[PDB]
């Protein structure tokens, strides 16, 4: 149908905007702490602690499959990155501190992305 195509074009455009958002958030992680999944070889007990692991590579795979239907789903995954790190790692660690900085810097980006999503529709 033509409606299905129009909906597919909307999803494609949302994907384009989320790619730009993802790039901007990932630049706020210049140490690449959140770039890849936590290694179960190196942290064998990780899944005893963290039930839904997340990282930027995993988000990018989902994004490129057009697997985010709306900005709320994308934000949920971003928040997992932060929130998982702040639970597993103590306050005095470079990891926890990196997460706090990512959260604070990413908030700005996400605030305008929400306005852009509502605005463009």
Residue 98's CATH number: 1.20.920.10
Angle at 68 between CA 84 and CA 95, to 5 degrees: 20
Q: How far is CA 109 from the centre of its chain?
A: 12
- 3-class DSSP assignment, residue 85: helix
Q: From the CB of residue 61, how many other CB atoms can be counted at a distance below 10 Å?
A: 10
Q: What is the C-alpha separation between 39 and 117, in angstroms, rounded? A: 34
Instruction: Write the CA distances from 39 to 6, 28, 46, 55, 56, integer angstroms.
Output: 40, 22, 8, 11, 14
Distance separating alpha carbons of residues 7 and 27, to the nearest angstrom? 30
In the three-class reduction of DSSP (H, G, I as helix; E, B as strand; rest coil), residue 53 is classed as coil
Of 5, 4, 7, 6, whose CA–CA distance to 69 is shortest?
7
- How many domains are there within the chain? 1
Helices and strands in the chain, H and E counts = 5, 0
The residue range of the domain holding 72 is 1-121
């Amino acid at each position: 149908s033509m409606e299905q195509v129009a909906m597919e074009l909307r999803l494609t455009e949302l994907t384009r905007l989320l790619r730009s958002v993802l790039d901007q958030l990932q630049d706020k992680d210049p140490a690449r702490i959140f770039a890849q999944p936590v290694s179960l070889k190196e942290v064998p007990d990780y899944l005893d602690h963290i039930k839904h692991p997340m990282d930027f590579a995993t988000m990018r795979k989902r994004l490129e499959a057009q697997g985010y239907k709306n900005l709320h789903e994308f934000e949920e995954d971003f928040d997992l990155i932060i929130d998982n790190c702040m639970k597993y790692n103590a306050r005095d660690t470079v990891f926890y501190r990196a997460a706090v900085r990512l959260r604070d810097q990413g908030g700005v980006v996400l605030r305008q992305a929400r306005r852009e999503v509502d605005s463009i529709g």
